[PDB]
């Protein structure tokens, strides 16, 4: 599934991603934006060999499994596979897990690079929420 914009904001609301551990819902907005453009179904293979999957480009390599990512870890106890549901659930319980590992939400590199310090709440602007 490819969301809108404000499809995807009312989606992260409904499942509690806004102002989880103080990251406003546009925060969430801008890092699926740069890491999927908001497609459920993206995949990227890493340099390492691990892939990132899904809206929020869960990496293979700590929190999901795919079966193919050399002594890497499960921590959402999931598939990668079910990263990729137009049901954004276990990507939103996954992101929860992830951003509360002590980086906040510098664990999304594109987050960082160009959410990071931005002026987010463009991102929410226009939506019914
Ligand atoms: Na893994």
Same mark, same amino acid.
């Given at each position: 599934?490819?969301?809108? #914009? !404000?499809?995807?904001?009312? /989606?992260?609301? &409904?499942?509690?991603?806004?102002?989880? #551990?103080?990251? *406003?819902?546009?925060?969430? %907005?801008?890092?699926?934006?740069?890491? *999927?453009?908001?497609?459920?179904? /993206?995949?990227? $293979?890493?340099?390492?060999?691990?892939?990132?999957?899904?809206?929020?480009?869960?990496?293979?390599?700590?929190?999901?499994? +795919?079966? $193919?990512?050399?002594? *890497?870890?499960?921590? !959402?106890?999931?598939?990668? *596979? /079910?990263?990729?549901?137009? +049901?954004?659930? /276990?990507?939103?319980?996954?992101?929860?897990?992830? %951003?509360?590992?002590?980086?906040?939400?510098?664990?999304? %590199?594109?987050? #960082?690079? &160009? !959410?990071?310090?931005? +002026? %987010?709440?463009?991102?929410? #602007?226009? !939506? $019914?929420?």
């Amino acid at each position: 599934k490819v969301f809108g #914009r !404000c499809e995807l904001a009312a /989606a992260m609301k &409904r499942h509690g991603l806004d102002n989880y #551990r103080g990251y *406003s819902l546009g925060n969430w %907005v801008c890092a699926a934006k740069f890491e *999927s453009n908001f497609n459920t179904q /993206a995949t990227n $293979r890493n340099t390492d060999g691990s892939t990132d999957y899904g809206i929020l480009q869960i990496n293979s390599r700590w929190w999901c499994n +795919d079966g $193919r990512t050399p002594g *890497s870890r499960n921590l !959402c106890n999931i598939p990668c *596979s /079910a990263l990729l549901s137009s +049901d954004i659930t /276990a990507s939103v319980n996954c992101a929860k897990k992830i %951003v509360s590992d002590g980086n906040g939400m510098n664990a999304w %590199v594109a987050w #960082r690079n &160009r !959410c990071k310090g931005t +002026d %987010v709440q463009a991102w929410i #602007r226009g !939506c $019914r929420l």
